[PDB]
Design a protein around this ligand. Structure first.
Ligand SMILES: Cc1cc2nc3c(=O)[nH]c(=O)nc-3n(C[C@H](O)[C@H](O)[C@H](O)COP(=O)(O)OP(=O)(O)OC[C@H]3O[C@@H](n4cnc5c(N)ncnc54)[C@H](O)[C@@H]3O)c2cc1C
Length: 370
């Protein structure tokens, strides 16, 4: 009677699938390749779609405590404010990655999800097996590929994949807010601080709570000072002097990494009893801040479709058919924004840009109209 799920990946997609399945009475085992459960990338934004998934997972309270909704999302071009957007009340939130990841881990443990670390999936079979790097073959009614970019679960099966890689990247960090030292201004806002002159450098300034500030320092990979890690303090201060107190702190972080990204569009997300979720299926450009939101909605939604009385194989097909278009459209528009630098103009969180954000996975409708 008790159905079994094997999840490869302990990132936001895997943790979400795990919790949602466990809530529905699945016996779920999650496998994380790393030696501990950690999330990288410094900070993250969630919108109403993602926040609803957390509500659905019973992990919302722990996320909202200790994270921040700025009074406004502000854009600057060459230090001039060009927009302030509040999205007609659409909920949104900024936090560190560890904060979101910890809430999800605690919830999974509270539910009794079996979590293994040092446990790497190297292959999956559509008939319902997952092979680990040690050689162990696990049978289950449902295998979830939540193993991120470069997914072995996906590549062991072979999907037709459109791949693209960005040449340019950014350096993401958590630093103290330094609020007093920043002096006059609106330093609780999101501030997307664009510049093309004297050089292409941008900081997305993203308060996570009273103590922690998430910064994303973005410069071309061809720029040997701006792309440097640990950060080349002088070049960031010269273009963002009003952030010097925080940048001095960022310069102390010798763990900084300059990270680029890749995008992935697949011919399908399923094969038999194997479902691909998150980056493994649909890595997208960061411009709409929806990569994880989409992953969380999709993982959540996969549990919904598995409650319909159908075989797993048919429930998977139904799931992709139902939920995929919101992700495809989001991915597409985000890619276009990123290629065209569209957010530089401000006022670009249009109703179509906000489509994925407006989606409520709990009631399966679009809310917070614009
Ligand atoms: C610059 C940038 C900014 C972004 N900002 C946002 C944002 O603000 N808001 C947002 O919603 N999204 C954002 N994203 C997207 C977001 O980072 C990803 O979409 C999301 O983290 C992917 O979740 P995941 O669970 O699919 O994969 P991952 O987070 O990559 O996790 C996969 C996990 O699987 C593990 N793993 C890997 N291989 C194996 C294996 N073989 N076996 C077992 N485990 C394995 C990994 O160790 C990792 O723990 C951003 C992306 C970029 C590039």
């Amino acid at each position: 009677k008790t159905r079994r799920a094997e999840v490869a990946g302990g990132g936001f997609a895997g943790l979400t699938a795990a919790i949602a399945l466990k809530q529905n009475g699945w016996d779920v085992r999650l496998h994380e390749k790393s030696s501990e459960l950690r999330a990288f990338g410094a900070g993250i934004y969630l919108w109403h779609n993602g926040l609803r998934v957390l509500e659905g997972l019973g992990a919302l309270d722990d996320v909202l405590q200790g994270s921040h909704t700025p009074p406004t999302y502000e854009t600057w071009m060459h230090n001039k404010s060009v927009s302030k957007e509040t999205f007609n009340g659409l909920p949104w939130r900024i936090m560190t990655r560890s904060h979101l990841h910890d809430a999800l881990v605690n919830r999974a443990r509270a539910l009794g999800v079996d979590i293994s670390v040092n446990s790497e999936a190297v292959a999956a079979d559509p008939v319902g097996r997952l092979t680990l790097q040690t050689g162990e073959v696990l049978e289950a009614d449902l295998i979830v590929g939540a193993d991120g970019v470069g997914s072995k679960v996906r590549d062991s099966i072979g999907f037709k994949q459109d791949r693209w890689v960005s040449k340019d990247g950014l350096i993401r960090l958590i630093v103290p807010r330094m609020k007093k030292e920043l002096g006059h201004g609106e330093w609780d806002n999101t501030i997307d601080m664009w510049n093309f002159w004297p050089r292409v450098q941008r900081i997305l300034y993203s308060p996570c709570n009273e103590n922690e500030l998430y910064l994303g320092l973005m410069a071309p990979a061809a720029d040997p000072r701006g792309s440097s890690v640990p950060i080349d303090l002088e070049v960031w201060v010269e273009m963002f002097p009003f952030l010097e107190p925080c940048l001095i702190e960022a310069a102390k972080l010798k763990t900084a990494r300059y990270d680029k990204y890749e995008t992935t569009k697949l011919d399908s997300w399923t094969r038999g009893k194997v479902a691909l979720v998150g980056d493994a299926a649909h890595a997208m450009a960061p411009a709409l801040a929806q990569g994880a939101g989409c992953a969380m909605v999709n993982a959540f939604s996969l549990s919904q479709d598995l409650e319909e009385g159908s075989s797993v194989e048919d429930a998977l097909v139904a799931w992709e058919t139902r939920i995929r278009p919101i992700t495809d459209r989001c991915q597409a528009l985000s890619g276009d924004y990123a290629a065209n630098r569209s957010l530089s103009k401000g006022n670009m969180f249009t109703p179509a840009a906000l489509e994925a954000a407006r989606y409520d996975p709990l009631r399966r409708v679009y809310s917070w109209p614009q």
